């Protein structure tokens, strides 16, 4: 739609990752976007993140929660390649090889909707 992958073509995305990797070791490049059609969570101004590699999916959710200023009791899920991870205790490092896109980013989307609502 107006998603990052639509705003920037594949080779441009791959070059961007290549450049940042040459500059910033031990950080994982992550695209974080609001799930299409989500209406109860805010937008972030940025979607391109550099995340220190030891941070887990659950910890990243805490970081994004803070930035969105969500109420602590608000439903919030961060999906990796649009689906739930088996464990949110995986570090950015350890899921990178598994979940990264060929362009070098890991793509995540956030939503307020649980798997079965």
């Amino acid at each position: 739609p107006g998603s990052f992958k639509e705003r920037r073509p594949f080779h441009e995305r791959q070059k961007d990752v290549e450049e940042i990797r040459s500059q910033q070791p031990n950080k994982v490049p992550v695209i974080i976007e609001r799930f299409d059609g989500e209406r109860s969570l805010p937008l972030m101004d940025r979607c391109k993140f550099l995340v220190p590699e030891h941070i887990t999916v659950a910890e990243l959710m805490s970081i994004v929660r803070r930035r969105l200023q969500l109420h602590p009791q608000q439903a919030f899920f961060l999906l990796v390649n649009e689906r739930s991870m088996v464990s949110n205790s995986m570090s950015m490092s350890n899921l990178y090889s598994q979940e990264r896109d060929p362009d070098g980013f890991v793509y995540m989307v956030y939503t307020s909707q649980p798997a079965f609502g």
């Binding site: 940042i20 972030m44 940025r46 391109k48 993140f49 550099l50 995340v51 990243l60 970081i63």
Partner: peptide, 4 residues
């Protein structure tokens, strides 16, 4: 880039 948004650097955490």
């Amino acid at each position: 880039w948004e650097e955490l």
